[PDB]
Structures are given as structure tokens and as C-alpha cells.
Design a protein around this ligand. Structure first.
Ligand SMILES: [Mg+2]
Ligand SMILES: [Mg+2]
Ligand SMILES: [Mg+2]
Ligand SMILES: [Mg+2]
Lengths: 143, 38, 11, 197, 100, 49, 62, 134, 120, 219, 69, 36, 31
RNA sequence: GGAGCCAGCGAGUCUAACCUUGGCCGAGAGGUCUUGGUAAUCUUGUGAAACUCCGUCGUGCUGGGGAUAGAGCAUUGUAAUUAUUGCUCUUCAACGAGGAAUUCCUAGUAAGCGCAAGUCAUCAGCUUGCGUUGAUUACGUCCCUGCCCUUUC
């Protein structure tokens, strides 16, 4: 975020400002985060209450995403939410009962389950079948 | 309206320049007023 | 109740 | 014994022998682990925990301090409680009573057993991380700290009072069950050190 | 009879589980001390919960708060310019700028 | 004056707002008796004191 | 099973990292056998430490 | 040789207040139910029925300890914090308590100022101490 | 006159004056019995010398302690120290010295603050 | 000439200094004490929680300390500086204006703590010489000739500007870099005795309500 | 949480049947196991003591401890 | 699982009386500097 | 000379007085 | 909510009206009639607070939180329906332990708690002093960082 009012920095909407900041604007595209959150949140498993989303911002900010949230699908109001989140450190529901989006203290491990399996998405790594992988993993643990 | 006491001096750039000119000018000839062992 | 592709309210 | 100023019977029963709060004997309490013998001090009996002694003057003067007084000191913590040792000793009295109630064993023995059990035997130091051994004084200090902080966090926002939660935490640490928070942390630390062994 | 989990007093919903004083405090215009005085004048035991109340107790409390003076509630107990200031501030700011 | 602590004292009716006080801090003042003094600081409440 | 070793010498000038002390301990089971270990807390001579492993030899930890 | 000072404070005060309530001769003002006893207090006494009697017992016992005591010092003694700066208690209640006690004859008007424990009150308080001791 | 001794105990601003005379085991603090000291939880801290040395040595004396200054805990410490020093002085003055030595050994073995003042 | 109080030990015994603050110091005042310790080579910072002035001075005098420095603040802003010389004074009080701490500078670095060279300027009056003598004797004697650190007290209209600089001798000139802090200290009171003795005679005091105060000079 | 605020008959019977079994009895124990209100627990604990079902070990205003008779 | 919409402002501003008070502080500070 | 003068490493905002006093100094010259 | 209940540093009225005990009135704030003190003598044992005991409440943004606002009862001037400082009731918000980072701290110390004076600089819910409760951990190292000393090598 940056004051012009505070706006989420974008690759296309803002080009001169990030150049002044000296950051490579190629890595300045929050829509990829937007699209993922949409599919992760809209996936049936999230509806089944078996999914929680964590976000490690490139600056090092770790964000809590409550499964109950419903992010906007329009990219503009998506950004308007996170400028609010980044500055206010949290987001409250319309009914004012639970904080859907909350920033949390690093590292991620303390927030992760006691018994959990950790993996990354690597193009170079061996190709696997997700369904077989999850089956062979234990039950009490988490992925 | 009259003032009763001297104002607090302000450290403008010129004052700093004058003072540092003094410091340098002192150290050029090594004019140090320091305590000497008896 | 929001469902499917219904968007959050616009004010 | 008859005196012009009347004195309770329990007071002469204490005249017979020194007992903590006039209810607990120091004769039968023993530290099972030999290594901790000369850092957990129970040989000198005391009526009440409060002593106002000097133990911070020298490096190992703490070891001579009675264990119960160290526990009371560690109990009073977190700002809103700072300076209130009288409440600490009252809570410790209630905790010892609760310990005796739940288990007929001597409560001081329970405290000693919990301290001995929850002490971390091996930990990690940065170099990456590498495993190192722990001095018994650090074992005692860390044991007291872990027991107290677990008991506190248990009853931070619960109906349970400090006395009951502290008693339960000492009980579970003494039995060695994983239910006690301090045992969990000790096992985690030893496992991490084992990984970097 | 059956404990009244909810009650309707003075067009206000009051939970049965709360004590009388701290249940009536929910009513607008009714605080802790005012509710306590109303309860005392109503001769209703404070240790009772709101649901234990009998109908005669409820109507007594009713007539109490609607008629405090009649039942000897103490009198002491019972209950543009900004724009001009802004304009003056603007005028002062302008004059100070003119000096500056 | 309306409140006095040895040398220190609080004065009223000089100024209608603390803004006027701000312009006149350090001002030399004196009594009819001839006791000299200084405007030290504007009280936040009430205005002008 | 954990062994017990009494400290016999607190070694110095080891270049050990701050907060860690390199010491020499003799096993209670066998007085002759002596091993160098690294301790994390305040340590003095005549004190007994619990050794989880009796095989590793201490090395300077920078 | 039983005395008030030989009995625990709380025990003596509670028993003596019970004795006054049973005795029923202690005048109680009509506003006891509607007063907070102090400015610092947020709400009035919970024990509406007997709090006045307990205050009477406390005042009587302090007068036993201390030969002469006045309204202001009782106000300070029964005062507490409301930053908080130790607001004093209500003087009307203490004054009515003293008036009622000297009505009973437990206390009476002191020369040199204050109230003195009356000799009748002296033997009375020793008596209640006596029953408490058993 | 009746044999008597006087001792002063101190901790922080709390100061206790103890008078120990021949008597019948009557102990009073601030004019009140020792058993009514407050706070109750520290009451045994007041009882320390009494129970350490035994009540028999007290049955033949009267003890009166007056305390002023400091807080409750400091006052308790002043009381206990004053009691101990008064007993030592009385046994020094009107009793044989072997008993004094045994009393001092007992008190010092238990807690030295009973006899020597601890000024912070 | 050196004052009688200091003449006995002038250049003989290295000064011993304790720096402390008022009761319940703010974080900034606690910070502010720190560089004053770093300012004087032989200073030690002491936490003043509940210490008493008779107790403090008596304990300090027993330990053999030379000077005691106490700091006062107002909302984390240093305000006053009082220097009391043992065993019998004098006590000098000062007011700190435009105080600039080194914590206000990012990436500042660490100080050098060599015995620094001292610069006193525009001190002409007899009172001024007294101020020089008091301040002069806080520091260690006989600084090394190549000592790289210089402390300057510049008197400008009764306001003593204080700066701390490190130099380097170049082929054509000397370039100084200030290390901080910056603060102007004005003497407003001086007593012949320790700070504890409130009844000690006042050698000098600052008259502020005299009509010529607005234009008057003292140092 | 919805803690029972009123002592109804089956709870009254439940208190009498079970409270002899517990080795350790206190306000928190009653609230946790019987799901009764704290005030009722205090009243019940005073109540049970009068019939001698439970014996007091120590009585402090904030904390009370009890055992089976 | 329950779904709740997030609450947020379209444009974030980090009533008028407070704005009045803020200007007083600015005007007071500027007047203070001029007087000195 | 300028680089090694963080008070005029770089100083925290608002530490100096120059921009204020200097700007008014020009205004006083105008008056 | 009751009950228990303990400090120290100080200040305080002449050509005046300061600290104020005690008595009475007032829900309170306060009013009123007297009284001691120019003060180790009277206010004042400054019966401070926190703190202890017995009770109500009970995991519920609840009897936590008291921001904002309304209505009244009083003091102070002054002649205005002007403000001013107190008390009563009602109203009852954000706040559920706080990101990236960051500052300080070794014994009567960190920390909690109140009382007193505003005595030429500064300070006005801010400065200073005074007193009460009172800890955890370390007290070893140059391994990292930084600063020095010696080689009259
Ligand atoms: Mg502090
Ligand atoms: Mg301060
Ligand atoms: Mg304070
Ligand atoms: Mg060190």
C-alpha cells in the first residue's frame, strides 16, 4: 500500500510510483493472489470446513484468512479490502461477530497444527498424483 | 509586548557552521584547553 | 444467503 | 501448656516440630534424582514461605532458598500481580491443600516430584542449532517457570482459580502424564535437541 | 410455575437468567442503582432471578417506575456556533499567513 | 488572579482564548503593587486562563 | 537410560559461544572415564549433570 | 478478664451487630436504603437490612479502642479510593450512628471534643466480648 | 523493682519496642494478644521465636510490644525481631548465660534476622 | 586558577562519576542518562528506584565517588542537569534546552570512549571560569595527543552549547563529524554544598525578574 | 455457554448422588461437571456441608475446598 | 460452513469537532513558533 | 561535510528547526 | 458491599482570613457555629493507598471498560441568565492481549500503590520529594558486534 489516499500497488494501474520505489514492477501483481483466494475459498472443501488459508506477503506480513470470509470477486474492491486490512491490521464482519481477516505474528509454524506434513509446489520436483499422496498420508496429521 | 527573559537560542545552519569552523580552527594548531597530569 | 457467484453488497 | 495469653493447641503441636503452615512435615520429603539434590533445598523447614531473604547477591545463593519460596516468587508475575507476595503464599497454601486432597501423598513431595520430572535434560543452542546439556540450576529454574506459566495460562480466562489449576498442573507433571503443559514443552525441547544431535 | 427464560417489561425484553437488578438495568433509563431502588421499593428479594418473579411482583415494579414520586423516590435521585468558531479560525489563519 | 502558589499563580480575564495566551507567552507583567512576573503557559481548561 | 557425570574442571579460553561453557565431567559409574561436554546454564565444579548420550565428544561451537 | 481487644475484630463486630439487631432499640434513619455511604462507592450497601447495625458496632468498638473520636476521623477511616485520591466517606451516616449509639448509652458526648465510650457501654461491650469468647 | 529489659527491633520504617519482665506468660502486641495479629497468613511469622524456643521459657515472664511505622509486613518483622532480642536480653540479665547461649544458637541457626537487623 | 575545592585533587585523582535520574524515569530519560554516561569516561549509571537523597549521597561519599549527576525530565524531554561535587560541593544546576539525543539518529553507530580533548570558549567572567573549572574536572586528565575525540562547550549569550565530535587530520584540512548529543545548558543556580543540603549557602543564583535579565550576560 | 441457573428436582438429586463420589469438591468442580451456576454451587456447597455429606478442609472467601465425608 | 460478508470502506481515511480540534493544535503550534 | 552530519546515518524526522526558522526569517526580512 | 486496617517527606493566618480538629445541618458536594496552631506543641498517629478477612457476582463484551451525551443539586467570582470547579441520576461506545519492527533493565532493582510541595530555571492530572508491597533471570565469556590498552613484535 502507498499514499497517493492509500491504494494497493498494481502492475498496470501504477507504473511510475513503483519505479520511484525502485521495486521491479513485474513482481507487483496482486491479482494472482486475488485469483487464488477466489478458487481456494470457493472450493467445495472450504464449504466443508476442512481448509484454512494463510498468506505470507512478500514484505513478511502473515495474514489469517477465516474460512467464513467472502472476498469480493471484483479486483478493485479486492484491493480496497486489503488496504483496509494492511492498515487496520484486521477486518470485522458486517454483523460484527468475528474477525474474518486478521494479521498474525510470524513464524507460521506456531499457528500450524502440532502434527502436520509440509510441502511446496515445485515445477522441478518429481510429478506426483495428489489423490494418492493424500491417501498414503496419515489421518491425524494435516497437510 | 516586552519579554522578561532571554529567548532559547535556535540552532540554525549558520550557527552550526560558525561553531564547527571554530572547532576545526582550534584543532588545526592543536589548541586544546585540557586537564594535565600533575 | 450468498451462493455461487453472487457478489457481496455494493453501497 | 498453660499461659496467661491463651495459645491454640496446634501451636504447641508445632512447637513439637516445624511444619509448613503447621500442616506439612519436611522430614519425609526426598529428591529422587541425585543430580538435583544440591539445588532443590528442602532440608531446612519453614513455617511460612515469606522470608525476605537475600538470594540475588551471589550467583548460586538461590540454591539455598527453600523451593516453596521460589515457587511463591515465581507465582507473582505479569505486572497486575507484581508486589503481591501475600496472595502468592495464600494461593500456594490453597494449592498444597488441594494437592493433599486429590492425592493422600505429602504435597511437598508432589511439588518436588513435579520439579524433578519437568526439568529439561537437554536443549539447543544456536551456532543452525546444536544440542547441549543443561546445568541443574537451569533445570530447576526452567521447571519452576514452566510449571507456573502453564498453571497461569490454564486459568487466565476460565472459571478455575489459580489454586486448583496449579494443583492439577503439579499433579500431572508429577505423574509424568503429557496432560501437564510443562511436560509437553520439556518433551518438545528434548526432541528438538535430539534432532540436532 | 415454569421459570420464565424471557420476560417483557416496559416494552423491553429481559432475560430470565440475569438477576433482577442487572436484568432491569437493560431497560432504557434504568441503571444499576435505579433498578436496585425500584427493587427495594417493590419489596422483591434481590437474590431472586428475573424468571422467578410472580405477576404481582412484576406489576408492582411496573407501577413503581412509572410513578416514582408517588412512591417517594427522591427528587435528587430521579433523572451554528461551531461554524462561527470555524470561520474565526479561518480568518485568524489567513491573517497569520499574511504576516507570514 | 484566582489561584496562588507562592510565586506561581493563575490569572483570568486577560484573554478570551488560549490562542491569545499563546501569542503573549513570555510577556512581562506586573501588579499594581509593582511585583513583576511572566506569562508562563496557557491552561488548557478554561479558555483564556 | 541417562548417565550421570560430576564436573571436575570448568575449562576456559575455549572460544565457546556466549551462554555455553565447555566443561570436563567424570562419569559417576566409572570415575576413570572422563568426557568433555558443553553446558547451557550456570555450572560449577562438584556438580552432577545428566548426559543423554555418553558417546559424543564436545566440539567448539563458535 | 475478658475485653473487646481480646476478641477477633470481625467476630466481635458481627456478634455485636447481631446483638443490636436483636435488641431492636437502635434508631435507624429512614434513608439507610437510599444512601451509598460515600461518594467513592458506586452502589449502596448490599446488606440493606443490617449494614447500619454493623457500622454501629464498628464505631462503638473503635470508640472503645480510642478514648475520643469525632465525625471527621470516622469519615476518613471509613473512606476509600474512588487518578484516585482517597475520597472521604459520608458524614451524615457516621453522625447518625453516633447519635443512635449515645441514645443507647453505649457512647456519649466527650469533653475536650468527640465521644467517650460510656461506662455502661464499657461493660456492655465487655459482655458481648464475653459471649463471643465461648 | 520488678526485673525488666527493653529492646528495639526495626525493619524499614517499622519500629517495635519490647518490654520483657518477670511474669506469668502474658504476651501482648499493641496492647492486644499475639494471637490476633494481622495479616493472619503471616501470623506464624510472629510465632517464630515462640515456637522455636518453646513456651516454657515464656511462662515465667510477661512481654509487651508496641509497634509503629512502616507497613504490615515490616511491622511483623519488627515484632518478631523485638521478641527475640528481648528474650535474649532478659536471659542475659536475670538468668544464667548458658541458657542465653542456647537461645542465641537456636535463633541464629533458624534465622539470623531474628537477632541481627537487616538494613537494606 | 583551579578552585579550592578541586585544587587538592586537580590532576591527581581521576574523577569518579555516578549518573542517575529522578524516581520513576521515563524511557527517554533512561536513554538520556545513557549517553551522559558515555559522555564522561569514568561515569556509571545507577537506577534510582526509591533511593533517598541522604542515603544516596552518604553511600556515594563512602564509595569514594567524585561527582554525582542527576537528571530531570518532563514527558520524556530532558529538562535539568545538576552536578554535585563531593565531599562538600559545590552543586551546580542547569536547564537543558533543544535536547537532541543520539537515539534520534538512524544507523548512528557506536561511540569512541577515549579520553577526549576539551574545548571551552567565550568563558571570560569570573563566574564563567568557575563553570569551566566545574565542568573541566568531570573528565580524565592528560588526554592522549592523538586522542581522536573532542568535546566542546561553547558559551553564546549565557547558553553553553554542547557537542561531541570525532576528527581526522587530512593533508589539507581537518574534517569533524559530530557524534551527538546536541544540547544547550544554562547555569541557573550554584550552591556551596552537596545537592542533599538544601540549606547550603548559594554562591550565585539566576535573577530572572530583574528588568535587565532580557539583555544580561553572565558567562 | 448456558450454565443452569435454577436448582430443579433432577439436578437436586444429581448433586446428592454424585458429590459423595468426588474426592475433591469445590465451586469450579461443580460448575464443570454438573453444569450448574457458580452462585448455586456456593449455596449447594454450604447446603451439602450442613447435612455432613462433605467435610471442610479450609474455608477462604474466594476459594473453598471440600472432600467426601 | 457459515458465510459472512467482510465489512470495509471503499476509501480509507486514517466528527467535525475533532477536525476543529486538530486545526487548533496546528494553529497553536504555528503561533508558538512565531512568538518565539 | 554534509554526508557526515545527520543532525542537519540520517536523522529522524522533525529533529531540526531550520526549515521553520529560515522560512520565517525571510518573511521578517520582507516586513 | 461490608469489616480489618498501617507510613514518611512537608505546608500552614498581621496589620490577616492560611492549615483546620470538635459540634450541628446537608444523600453527596457542601453549608454553618466554635476551636488549636506563626507551629518537634494545633490540623496530624496526616486511621494514605495498594493490602488482609467475610460476603454478592460469575465466562456471558457480564456486576470489566467508562469514551460521548442529557437532566439536575451546589461553590467561585460578577451582574451576566456569563462561564468556573465538585456531586446525583441516566446514556454505555471502541477495547477479547495487539503485525512488521523497536526501547530499556541486574537488589530493596524491574514492577504495583498512594501521600505531600508547587518554594526565581522547567513543570499544572505535569515536575520534584516522600513513604508502602516487592519479584524472575544473569552476575560467566570474548565466540558475534563495538571500544580501548601493551609490544621505551
Ligand atoms: Mg518503577
Ligand atoms: Mg517523573
Ligand atoms: Mg506515580
Ligand atoms: Mg558483566
Amino acid at each position: 500500500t502507498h499514499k497517493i489516499k492509500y491504494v494497493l500497488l498494481n502492475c498496470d494501474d501504477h507504473q511510475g510510483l513503483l519505479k520511484k520505489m525502485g521495486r521491479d514492477i513485474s513482481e507487483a501483481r496482486p491479482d494472482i493472489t486475488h485469483q487464488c483466494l477466489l478458487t481456494l475459498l470457493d472450493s467445495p472443501i472450504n464449504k466443508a470446513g476442512k481448509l484454512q488459508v494463510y498468506i505470507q506477503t512478500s514484505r513478511g506480513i502473515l495474514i489469517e484468512v477465516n474460512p467464513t470470509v467472502r472476498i469480493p470477486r471484483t479486483f478493485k474492491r479486492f484491493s480496497g479490502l486489503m488496504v483496509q486490512l494492511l492498515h487496520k491490521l484486521s477486518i470485522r464482519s458486517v454483523n460484527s461477530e468475528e474477525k474474518l481477516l486478521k494479521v498474525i505474528k510470524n513464524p507460521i509454524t506456531d499457528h500450524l497444527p502440532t502434527k502436520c506434513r509440509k510441502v511446496t509446489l515445485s515445477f522441478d520436483a518429481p510429478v506426483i498424483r495428489v489423490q494418492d499422496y493424500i491417501e498414503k498420508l496419515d489421518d491425524d496429521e494435516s497437510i | 509586548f516586552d519579554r522578561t527573559a532571554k529567548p532559547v537560542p535556535v540552532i540554525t545552519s549558520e550557527v552550526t557552521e560558525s561553531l564547527e569552523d571554530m572547532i576545526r580552527r582550534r584543532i588545526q594548531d592543536s589548541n586544546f584547553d585540557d586537564l594535565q597530569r600533575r | 444467503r450468498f451462493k455461487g457467484d453472487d457478489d457481496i453488497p455494493y453501497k | 501448656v498453660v499461659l496467661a495469653t491463651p495459645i491454640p493447641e496446634e501451636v504447641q503441636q508445632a512447637q513439637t516440630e516445624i511444619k509448613l503452615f503447621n500442616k506439612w512435615s519436611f522430614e519425609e520429603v526426598e529428591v529422587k534424582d541425585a543430580s538435583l539434590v544440591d539445588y532443590v533445598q528442602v532440608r531446612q523447614p519453614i513455617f511460612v514461605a515469606h522470608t525476605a531473604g537475600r538470594y540475588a547477591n551471589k550467583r548460586f545463593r538461590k540454591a539455598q532458598c527453600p523451593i516453596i519460596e521460589r515457587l511463591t516468587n515465581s507465582l507473582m508475575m505479569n505486572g497486575r500481580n507484581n508486589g503481591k507476595k501475600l496472595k502468592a503464599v495464600r494461593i500456594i497454601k490453597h494449592t498444597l491443600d488441594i494437592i493433599n486432597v486429590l492425592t493422600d501423598q505429602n504435597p511437598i513431595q508432589v511439588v518436588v516430584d513435579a520439579i524433578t520430572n519437568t526439568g529439561p535434560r537437554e536443549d539447543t543452542t544456536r551456532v543452525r542449532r546444536q544440542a547441549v546439556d543443561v546445568s541443574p540450576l537451569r533445570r530447576v529454574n526452567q521447571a519452576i517457570a514452566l510449571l507456573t506459566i502453564g498453571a497461569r495460562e490454564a486459568a487466565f480466562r476460565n472459571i478455575k482459580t489459580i489454586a486448583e489449576t496449579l494443583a492439577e498442573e503439579l499433579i500431572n507433571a508429577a505423574k509424568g502424564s503429557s496432560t501437564s503443559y510443562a511436560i509437553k514443552k520439556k518433551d518438545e525441547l528434548e526432541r528438538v535437541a535430539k534432532s540436532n544431535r | 410455575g415454569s421459570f420464565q427464560h424471557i420476560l417483557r417489561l416496559l416494552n423491553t425484553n429481559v432475560d430470565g437468567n440475569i438477576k433482577i437488578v442487572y436484568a432491569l438495568t437493560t431497560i432504557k433509563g434504568v441503571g444499576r442503582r435505579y433498578s436496585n431502588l425500584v427493587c427495594k421499593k417493590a419489596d422483591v428479594d434481590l437474590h431472586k432471578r428475573a424468571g422467578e418473579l410472580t405477576q404481582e411482583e412484576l406489576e408492582r415494579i411496573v407501577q413503581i417506575m412509572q410513578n416514582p414520586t408517588h412512591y417517594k423516590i427522591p427528587a435528587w435521585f430521579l433523572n451554528t456556533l461551531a461554524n462561527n468558531v470555524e470561520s474565526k479560525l479561518r480568518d485568524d489563519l489567513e491573517r497569520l499567513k499574511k504576516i507570514r | 488572579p484566582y489561584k496562588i502558589f507562592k510565586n506561581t499563580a493563575f490569572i483570568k480575564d486577560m484573554f478570551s482564548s488560549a490562542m491569545e495566551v499563546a501569542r503573549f507567552e513570555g510577556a512581562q507583567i506586573k501588579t499594581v503593587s509593582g511585583i513583576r512576573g511572566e506569562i508562563k503557559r496557557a491552561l488548557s481548561k478554561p479558555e483564556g486562563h | 537410560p541417562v548417565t550421570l557425570a560430576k564436573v571436575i574442571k570448568v575449562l576456559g579460553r575455549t572460544g565457546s559461544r556466549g551462554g555455553v561453557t565447555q566443561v570436563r565431567v567424570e562419569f559417576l559409574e566409572d570415575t576413570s572415564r572422563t568426557i568433555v561436554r558443553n553446558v547451557k546454564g550456570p555450572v560449577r565444579e562438584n556438580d552432577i549433570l545428566v548426559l543423554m548420550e555418553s558417546e559424543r565428544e564436545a566440539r567448539r561451537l563458535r | 478478664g475478658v475485653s473487646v481487644r481480646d476478641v477477633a475484630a470481625q467476630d466481635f463486630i458481627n456478634a455485636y451487630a447481631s446483638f443490636l439487631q436483636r435488641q431492636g432499640k437502635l434508631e435507624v434513619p429512614g434513608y439507610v436504603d437510599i444512601v451509598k455511604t460515600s461518594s467513592g462507592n458506586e452502589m449502596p450497601p448490599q446488606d440493606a437490612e443490617g449494614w447500619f447495625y454493623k457500622r454501629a458496632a464498628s464505631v462503638a468498638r473503635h470508640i472503645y479502642m480510642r478514648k475520643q473520636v469525632g465525625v471527621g476521623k470516622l469519615n476518613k477511616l471509613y473512606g476509600g479510593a474512588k487518578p484516585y485520591k482517597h475520597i472521604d466517606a459520608s458524614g451524615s451516616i457516621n453522625r447518625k450512628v453516633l447519635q443512635a449509639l449515645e441514645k443507647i448509652g453505649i457512647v456519649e458526648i466527650s469533653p475536650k471534643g468527640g465521644r467517650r465510650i460510656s461506662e455502661n457501654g464499657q461493660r456492655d461491650l465487655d459482655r458481648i466480648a464475653a459471649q463471643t469468647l465461648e | 523493682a520488678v526485673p525488666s529489659v527493653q529492646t528495639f527491633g526495626k525493619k524499614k520504617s517499622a519500629t517495635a519496642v519490647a518490654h520483657v519482665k518477670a511474669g506469668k506468660g502474658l504476651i501482648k502486641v499493641n496492647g492486644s494478644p499475639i494471637t490476633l495479629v494481622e495479616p493472619e497468613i503471616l501470623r506464624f511469622k510472629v510465632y517464630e521465636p515462640l515456637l522455636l524456643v518453646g513456651l516454657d521459657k515464656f511462662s515465667n515472664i510477661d512481654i509487651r510490644v508496641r509497634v509503629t511505622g512502616g507497613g504490615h509486613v515490616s511491622q511483623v518483622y519488627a515484632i518478631r525481631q523485638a521478641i527475640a532480642k528481648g528474650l535474649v536480653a532478659y536471659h542475659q540479665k536475670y538468668v544464667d548465660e548458658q541458657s542465653k547461649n542456647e537461645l542465641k544458637k537456636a535463633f541464629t541457626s533458624y534465622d539470623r534476622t531474628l537477632l541481627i537487623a537487616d538494613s537494606r | 586558577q583551579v578552585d579550592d575545592e578541586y585544587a587538592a585533587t586537580s590532576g591527581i585523582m581521576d574523577p569518579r562519576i555516578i549518573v542517575t535520574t529522578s524516581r520513576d524515569p521515563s524511557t527517554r530519560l533512561s536513554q538520556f542518562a545513557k549517553e551522559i554516561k558515555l559522555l564522561f569516561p569514568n561515569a556509571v549509571r545507577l537506577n534510582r528506584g526509591n533511593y533517598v537523597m541522604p542515603n544516596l549521597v552518604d553511600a556515594c561519599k563512602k564509595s569514594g565517588t567524585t561527582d554525582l549527576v542527576v537528571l530531570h525530565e518532563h514527558r520524556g524531554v530532558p529538562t535539568s542537569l545538576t552536578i554535585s561535587h563531593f565531599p562538600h560541593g559545590p552543586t551546580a544546576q542547569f536547564s537543558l534546552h533543544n535536547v537532541v539525543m543520539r537515539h534520534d539518529i538512524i544507523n548512528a553507530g557506536n561511540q569512541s570512549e577515549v579520553n577526549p580533548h576539551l574545548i571551552f570558549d567565550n568563558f571570560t567572567t569570573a563566574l564563567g571560569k568557575r563553570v569551566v573549572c566545574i565542568l573541566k574536572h568531570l573528565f580524565n586528565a592528560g588526554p592522549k595527543k592523538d586522542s581522536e575525540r573532542v568535546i566542546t562547550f561553547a558559551n553564546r549569550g549565557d547558553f553553553i552549547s554542547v557537542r561531541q565530535h570525532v576528527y581526522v587530520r587530512t593533508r589539507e584540512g581537518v574534517e569533524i563529524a559530530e557524534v551527538g548529543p546536541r544540547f544547550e545548558m544554562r547555569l541557573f543556580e550554584l550552591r556551596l554544598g552537596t545537592l542533599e543540603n538544601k540549606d547550603a549557602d548559594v554562591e550565585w543564583q539566576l535573577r530572572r525578574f530583574i528588568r535587565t535579565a532580557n539583555k544580561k550576560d553572565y558567562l | 455457554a448456558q450454565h443452569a441457573v435454577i436448582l430443579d428436582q433432577e439436578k437436586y438429586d444429581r448433586i446428592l448422588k454424585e458429590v459423595p463420589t468426588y474426592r475433591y469438591v469445590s465451586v469450579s468442580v461443580l460448575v464443570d461437571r454438573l453444569k450448574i451456576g457458580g452462585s448455586l454451587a456456593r449455596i449447594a456447597l454450604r447446603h451439602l456441608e450442613k447435612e455432613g455429606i462433605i467435610k471442610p478442609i479450609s474455608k477462604h472467601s474466594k476459594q473453598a475446598i471440600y472432600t467426601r465425608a | 460452513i457459515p458465510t459472512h460478508a467482510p465489512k470495509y470502506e471503499e476509501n480509507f481515511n486514517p466528527k467535525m469537532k475533532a477536525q476543529l480540534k486538530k486545526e487548533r493544535k496546528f494553529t497553536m503550534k504555528e503561533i508558538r513558533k512565531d512568538a518565539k | 561535510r554534509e554526508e557526515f552530519n545527520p543532525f542537519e546515518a540520517v536523522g529522524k524526522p522533525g529533529i531540526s528547526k531550520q526549515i521553520g526558522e529560515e522560512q520565517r526569517k525571510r518573511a521578517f526580512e520582507a516586513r
